[PDB]
């Protein structure tokens, strides 16, 4: 099933070849080229009809490999209709090579459908929450004011940020010109900052309401909640629009200047100061507040069990009941999902400031998509109340 190429036959066997053909450049002296040979025998049989495996011995046929810039061996070039679709320079296992071939044979279609469901979950989920709070008199509580702030931030992520994001990934270029690149980038940072800062404010709201319910009623008014909400949006604006629209975020580097001059380029390139300052204000200060606050809810509940056991006069030791285990799960989901979604992106974002070439561009963009996924998660996490569930069923006919 494997074709054994020469220099003469290469144009007919590979460039003029029907469909997909995987070219292996190997040598009799190269130990990593012997290691892959028995894996390509299995792939030639298992991927029958999907691709053709072709082998070229570099010792016998030295003339072909320089034309495609072969620096190391074994190198596997997948060809599609006279052109090199995908490249590698290292030896692999059968399992790792199966994944590479599956990814490049199917023309990235999974990638595009996965953006579509993300937009659908974010818009459906958040419209349903704003509707539920807006329609139902019982849901218009002080907490649900902060939930409404969050719901709007995540909604604008689904309607405007993720779509224009999706297009830049698909087309590989920015079609809407320099201004809308700057406006879209500002709208991204605004809504992500507003979302994550409002998660932090919700943590503080629930902590006061749980640990200090009578102090919370007098201390947290509707007027004070409005001021807090307005402050989070004001901060979000002054970190997003003010720096991006006035070009303060701009790096001086000439490779960066080519992206700022070209309307087709909408790469997110920041100076060190903006990358740090925006990351701290959007994520790390909110994350530390949420860790500190939700820890004091755990400590309070644990210490309150100590008060119950102390007051027994050594009669009963309390164990975790259903209510405590559910509470501890809810705490797990809040910190778990928020951190999983946004820590990788903001960790990588601070790592680029130190050494630029360490983390690839795909990983950076992929982690930013994982952050956008949090906007779909937040309705699921923060709107589980019986009153929410009643209203959701009432709105769905």
């Amino acid at each position, epitope marked *: 099933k494997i074709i054994h190429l020469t220099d003469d036959s290469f144009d007919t066997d590979v460039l003029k070849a029907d469909g997909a053909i995987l070219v292996d450049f190997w040598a009799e002296w190269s130990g990593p080229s012997k290691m892959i040979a028995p894996i390509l025998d299995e792939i030639a049989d298992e991927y029958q009809g999907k691709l053709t495996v072709a082998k070229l011995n570099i010792d016998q046929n030295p003339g072909t490999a320089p034309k495609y810039g072969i620096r190391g061996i074994p190198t596997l070039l997948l060809f599609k209709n006279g052109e090199v679709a995908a490249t590698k320079v290292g030896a692999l296992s059968k399992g790792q090579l199966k994944e590479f071939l599956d990814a490049n044979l199917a023309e990235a279609k999974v990638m595009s459908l996965l953006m579509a469901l993300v937009v659908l979950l974010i818009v459906a989920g958040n419209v349903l929450v704003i509707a539920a709070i807006g329609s139902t008199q019982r849901l218009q509580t002080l*907490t649900n004011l902060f939930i409404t702030s969050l719901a709007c931030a995540d909604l604008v992520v689904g309607l405007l940020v993720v779509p224009f994001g999706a297009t830049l990934v698909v087309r590989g270029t920015w079609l809407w010109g320099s201004f809308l690149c700057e406006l879209w980038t500002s709208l991204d940072v605004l809504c992500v900052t507003a979302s994550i800062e409002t998660l932090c404010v*919700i943590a503080i709201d*629930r902590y006061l*309401a*749980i*640990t*200090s*319910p*009578f*102090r919370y009623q007098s201390l947290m008014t509707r007027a004070r909640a409005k001021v807090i909400i307005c402050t989070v949006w004001a901060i979000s604006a002054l970190v997003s629009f003010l720096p991006i629209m006035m070009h303060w975020w701009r790096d001086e580097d000439p490779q960066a200047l080519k992206c700022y001059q070209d309307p087709g380029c909408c790469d997110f390139v920041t100076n060190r100061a903006y990358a740090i300052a925006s990351s701290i204000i959007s994520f790390y200060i909110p994350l530390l507040i949420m860790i500190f606050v939700y820890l004091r*809810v755990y400590r*309070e*509940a*644990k210490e*309150q*069990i100590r008060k*119950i056991d102390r*007051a*027994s006069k050594r*009669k*009963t030791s309390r164990v975790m*009941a*259903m*209510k*405590e285990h*559910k*509470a501890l799960k*809810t*705490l797990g989901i*809040i910190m778990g999902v928020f951190t999983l979604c946004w820590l990788p992106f903001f960790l990588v974002n601070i790592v680029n400031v130190f050494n630029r070439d360490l983390v690839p561009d795909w990983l950076f963009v992929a982690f930013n998509w994982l952050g956008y996924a949090n906007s779909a998660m937040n309705p699921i*996490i*923060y709107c*589980r*109340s*019986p*009153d929410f569930r009643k209203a959701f069923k009432r709105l769905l006919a």
Partner: nanobody
Amino acid sequence: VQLQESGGGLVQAGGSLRLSCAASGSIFSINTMGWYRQAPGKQRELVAAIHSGGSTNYANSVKGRFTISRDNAANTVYLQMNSLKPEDTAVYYCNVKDYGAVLYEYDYWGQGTQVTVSS
């Protein structure tokens, strides 16, 4: 979770009663146990409430007269009601606000125990 109410009934004006509510069932460590009342032809209103943390909150009508406390170990809340007036006549309800959901509170209500103060 069941809220069993005792201690109510008939008492002369100037007299005292002691309501007790024993909450049998799974409640989160952090909670607020309380006494609400509904007088005839009025809406339900908070009498008194005591947080797990030991904070208290009383209606101005019952300040100085009524004292709310909870049992040191058990989920049992006591409203000692002194200097009772015919104004205080009402169906008194035990309430437990459980905070185990973290993002919302769950309400439990007692059936309610009649208190009638005569002049």
